[PDB]
Amino acid sequence: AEPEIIASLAPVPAPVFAIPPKPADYNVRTLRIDEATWLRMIPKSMNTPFQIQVTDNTGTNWHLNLRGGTRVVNLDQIAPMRFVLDLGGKSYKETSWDPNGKKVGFIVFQSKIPFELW
Amino acid sequence: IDSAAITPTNMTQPDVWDALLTMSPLSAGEVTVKGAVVSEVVPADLIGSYTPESLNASL
Amino acid sequence: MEVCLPNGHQVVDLINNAFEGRVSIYSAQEGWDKTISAQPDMMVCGGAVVCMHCLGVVGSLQRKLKHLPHHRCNQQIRHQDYVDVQFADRVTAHWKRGMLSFVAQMHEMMNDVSPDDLDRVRTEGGSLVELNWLQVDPNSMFRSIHSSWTDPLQVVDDLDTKLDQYWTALNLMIDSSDLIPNFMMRDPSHAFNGVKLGGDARQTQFSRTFDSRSSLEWGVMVYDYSELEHDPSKGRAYRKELVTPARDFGHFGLSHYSRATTPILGKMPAVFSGMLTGNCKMYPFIKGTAKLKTVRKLVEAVNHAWGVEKIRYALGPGGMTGWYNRTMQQAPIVLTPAALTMFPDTIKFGDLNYPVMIGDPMILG
Amino acid sequence: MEVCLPNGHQVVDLINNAFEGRVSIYSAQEGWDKTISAQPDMMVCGGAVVCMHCLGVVGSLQRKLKHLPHHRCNQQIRHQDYVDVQFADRVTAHWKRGMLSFVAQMHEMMNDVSPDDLDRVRTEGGSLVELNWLQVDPNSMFRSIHSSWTDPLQVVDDLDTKLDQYWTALNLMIDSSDLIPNFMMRDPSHAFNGVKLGGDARQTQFSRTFDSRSSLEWGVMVYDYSELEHDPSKGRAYRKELVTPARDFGHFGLSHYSRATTPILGKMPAVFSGMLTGNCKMYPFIKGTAKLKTVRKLVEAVNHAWGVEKIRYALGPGGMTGWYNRTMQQAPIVLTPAALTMFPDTIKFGDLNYPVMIGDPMILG
């Protein structure tokens, strides 16, 4: 257990202090921005959705829509990591949208403008 | 995402984030505090400095 | 006993509770009571008790406290650093009391109005009731020069319930009688800009916030519908089809929209939440960034007093300044009551058609 | 570096993408582009890059690839093993482009219909638009006798969105004007079996798939309603109450169902998704078992050129042959788009009423 390490009063290197970690679970939609410092939101009342086109590694093009209330994860200062997403049990059903047969994916943006001003 | 353009009236959900996310570190030499990486950590100052909400929302 | 700094969401909760004026203050002279002004010692923020002399967490709400606990205090925090929050809280409390007085006076006059008068006013348009503008708030901040913010608060019970009941009764009576009041606005922002001022009111200044570097003494502001009742082409049918609030806001009996009032007191519009939400609550029309600005001095005081590692481990990434900037960026989402942004969008009668002047409140059919 | 075999769901995804006509194929001379046919080197199956020389998983979609990575490839798989999938993909692409050409010609011409003629058509029935079937994609392999599936693909950008816009506009004006088309079917399976054949069409041979042996050079089929117009008892009101598609499929705007077309091109019926799903997507009417038939030779090659324990650990219980049998059992849902099973249950007009003949498409009324 290493009592002197766990009770030091001076800075300790991260490789020395660290131990094998464990996975964690979250639900991004139900989190709160004030507590979660790694989440960014497009502020509401923006109320004018805009379309956009993005190409994948192979070269195929895809269409996405960005509106007010969209959340992203700040990928800076969070260390190498792996994300797995599961949508089992949700509905995502609307009058003019049937989820069966549709496609979902991860999109990564690199930009110089803060995400809130988009 | 769709190969064709999506009419903004048909789709109203901002995203598909209403799901379950599993997050796993890919290294054992980095440590984060309140969601940001630090090179060194002082153990004595981590005592009594975490609310339940912060601990739940931590990395 | 060592102590630790509070957290960001706790500070945000403190700011919110200050701006709806329910922050609990502990002073050695007065205990937990807040009727008599005194130098604060601890406050409750985010469900944690914090000592003002060090801004350190000393306890919580789970266990009762009868005195200031024995602890190590740096005593590096001064009253000038956090006087702003106390000022905002006290001003909000006084404003709430004044609004309650005005509303209850209006409702009691409503009850005193005679049924034959109701019948006559419903038959042909006329001024059902009017109140002279001098009586409201005789000795408060907003209508006197002698009073000050240090003055004792006026003691009332179940203030929120009284506000809800009186406001609901008044609105139901107005909707039943198809009346027209001169003190309700469709959009509070039109009070700050978008309305023509009359009766000298052109000289007013709207600080749009409760602050020390401004004057809170001013007269009551009401709409001018004299020409509205003057025009012979206008008929009671037109008044009921367009000028009646229920036509634009909707039936208060079944509506989730929030109502607003003219800057009666302190040059500050009041917003009442819709009844369908569960209850009617009154909120001042204040901007989130203006709310956030009150802790600028406290940020510097904390940076001077506490240590870098403690600040980083408590507040979060970037320290106190980083938290300040991030909360500035996210101010509209978090530092905003829900009722403040849930106003009706479609407007028919229009909130900008007649001037606003200092005069006697009056309602008509 | 050694490699491992892909998985069953990945192979199913590959089959689905191949039969929908979107498979990323990398060739040495051309790259990731597919305009010019060549020998495939690697293809994307369910998010995994697979080397065609030895069917090994060499990469993924998460990192960019510019060349075939250095790896130990057994070089035991020949072009004959997987030529079938490439043939199906290219044939699907050509068919989609030809169908878009046909539909856009229909849209532009029946838009060029004049308003007075349209009104006269509403008043009494008539042939609004007529296109010679010789004008429908002359240079396609389905029409031209000197065009092969190896010919370059026509460059059509934003293909699916253009197709959706044209199809939606066409159907909207059709059901707004209550017109009668000749190239739509209530049930596409009747074309394969259940519709009376015209004199010239009595020699038709339906392969019901896209295969090497089948001959895809054939004429353009349309329904025959000349006797419908010549029918004395037939009136415009009767056409509206029965012959109108909206009477059975439902109104295009509020219809969650799927539309079907006659074998216009390549003797293969097409199916269009409705508005309520979200958009119009076009699929062929190929059965899932026919799609699954294409990988039998690939299964044989893998069994011949891979270790039994590797196959068991990668594909699953029973080996790759067991996977083939299980997928054959499970085909009706795993290898079938949901659109293909959303056809109208009951049709009062019927789809076998009148014969089908190879001739000029028209929109009549």
- A1: which strand partners? none
- Residues A109, A115, B2, B3, Cα dihedral to 10°: -50
The encoded tokens of residue C299 equal 């940020």
Q: Does A62 sit within 8 Å of B10, measured CB to CB?
A: no
- The fold of the C1-90+287-336 domain, in CATH, is Outer-capsid protein sigma 3, small lobe (3.90.1630)
Q: CA D141 to CA D149: how far, in whole Å?
A: 7
Instruction: Count chain A–chain B contacts defined by CB atoms under 8 A.
Output: 181
* Total residue count of chain B as it appears in this document: 59
- Contacts with C238 (C-beta within 8 Å, 6 or more apart), sequence order: none
- Contacts with C335 (C-beta within 8 Å, 6 or more apart), sequence order: C12, C15, C16, C288, C289, C291, C292, C327
DSSP state of D38: -
Q: How many angstroms separate the Cα of C311 from the Cα of each of A36, B34, B55, C51, C274?
A: 17, 12, 17, 16, 41
* Distance (Å) from the alpha carbon of D233 to chain A's nearest alpha carbon: 40
Q: CA D171 to CA C293: how far, in whole Å?
A: 58
Q: How was this structure determined?
A: cryo-EM
* B/C touch flag: 3 or more CB pairs below 8 Å: yes
Q: CA C84 to CA C301: how far, in whole Å?
A: 14
Q: Does B51 sit within 8 Å of C313, measured CB to CB?
A: no
User: Per-domain residue ranges for chain C?
Assistant: 1-90+287-336, 91-286+337-365
Confirm if C27 and C41 have CB atoms less than 8 A apart.
yes
The encoded tokens of residue D103 equal 């539909």
CB atoms within 10 A of CB C62: 6
Local structure of C9: helix, strand or coil? helix
Confirm if D249 and D232 have CB atoms less than 8 A apart.
no
Q: Provide the CA C272 distance to its chain's centre, in angstroms.
A: 10
Q: CA D206 to CA D269: how far, in whole Å?
A: 11
Q: Does A59 sit within 8 Å of D24, measured CB to CB?
A: yes
Q: Which amino acid is at C233?
A: S
Local structure of D266: helix, strand or coil? coil
Q: Where are the alpha helices (DSSP H) in B1-59?
A: 52-57
Q: CA D63 to CA D48: how far, in whole Å?
A: 11
Q: CA A63 to CA C90: how far, in whole Å?
A: 53
Chains touching B, CB cut-off 8 Å, 3+ pairs: A, C, D
Confirm if B34 and B51 have CB atoms less than 8 A apart.
no
- The fold of the D91-286+337-365 domain, in CATH, is Outer-capsid protein sigma 3, large lobe (3.90.1320)
Among residues D39, D4, D55, D96, the alpha carbon closest in space to that of D281 is found at: D96
Q: CA D241 to CA D250: how far, in whole Å?
A: 12
* Total residue count of chain D as it appears in this document: 365
Contact list in C for residue A11 (CB cut-off 8 A) is 309
Q: Where are the alpha helices (DSSP H) in C186-307?
A: 189-192, 226-230, 236-238, 245-248, 288-292, 296-305
- Contacts with C278 (C-beta within 8 Å, 6 or more apart), sequence order: none
- B23: which strand partners? A24, A83
DSSP state of C4: B
Burial (CB < 10 A; 0-12, 13-18, 19+), residue D104, is middle
